[PDB]
């Protein structure tokens with residue numbers, strides 16, 4: 001209905017539609033990236049993969065194949081009924097090898113779901129969210145120039161979370177994190 | 192200071208500062224508008240005022256003196272330690288005499304506070320807000336073209352609420368509502 005149409009018209013009016021694909025070279029070894037680079041699952045156990053510098057070795061993260069150094073961009077992710085997932089953006093310069101907390105101070109702007117029902121923003125400390133309708137599809141919205149990262153229910157247009165406006169250092173990558181083994185993959189919607 | 196600075200630079204990149212004054216001709220007869228038209232209080236009982244067509248006769252509402260038919264606008268409101276208030280925008284065509292529920296379907300976009308601690312967006316159904324620090328000062332952000340109404344803690348830049356993007360009909364007015372008789376006024380910050 002009207003709320004979906006207005007969500008469509010807003011994203012079209014102001015945000016460059018990103019066509020995002022997963023970069024398997026960056027993916028933590030426990031992650032499985034689909035051949036078409038749209039879908040993300042977790043393996044039972046870490047695969048034997050090279051620890052090249054670009055690969056996340058601690059966090060169960062993967063990046064997109066393109067970064068943003070300017071402009072407004074959006075993309076949508078089919079989270080469906082998956083009980084655990086976090087998505088957003090992170091800086092090129094994040095710690096990929098050693099333990100760090102995924103927080104804006106450490107260069108990550110992400111939100112998501114734990115244990116089926118606990119929505120959080122990964123602020124420091126974590127922000128417990130109240131979500132009246134669990135999203136099946138999440139829109140990720142970036143405005144580089146104003147330091148804005150926001151998240152919507154892409155089916156009904158309802159707002160989920162907006163980080164405080166910040167200042168970004170260097171390129172921002174789409175980032176995806178899953179900690180659990182379960183049937184429903186994360187799937188990127190094509191532009 | 193960084194969150195405050197980014198909030199300031201965001202308002203400057205995108206939103207025209209509105210210099211909002213209260214129109215006493217619109218004010219429910221239980222409301223008092225200050226001589227400088229920036230402050231709002233509540234009377235013990237309705238005062239004797241003309242029932243001109245613009246006046247809210249049921250709802251404890253008052254409008255700004257200027258409407259918006261286009262563009263990006265913000266204003267900030269000092270709610271201070273008030274236990275109760277609602278602010279936002281409404282259409283020119285809202286029902287002013289009969290009761291109507293203050294919902295987007297009826298042409299009202301407001302959030303506020305009840306009972307000192309219950310923050311709500313007056314969506315339908317109402318959205319329970321979780322607010323980590325009670326705001327003293329609230330920024331109201333309108334984008335007419337994309338049908339966007341959003342609200343921020345104007346002192347730390349944290350986001351409070353964004354309504355689903357919608358389609359506005361006709362001019363929008365700043366609206367302000369207080370239901371309680373309590374020591375702290377509602378006061379508009381000058382541009």
Ligand code: DMA
Nearest residue numbers: 058059060101102122126179
């Ligand atoms: C691989 C792994 C156990 C990461 C989760 O990080 P965390 O326990 O600090 O939690 P979160 O980032 O979800 O707050």
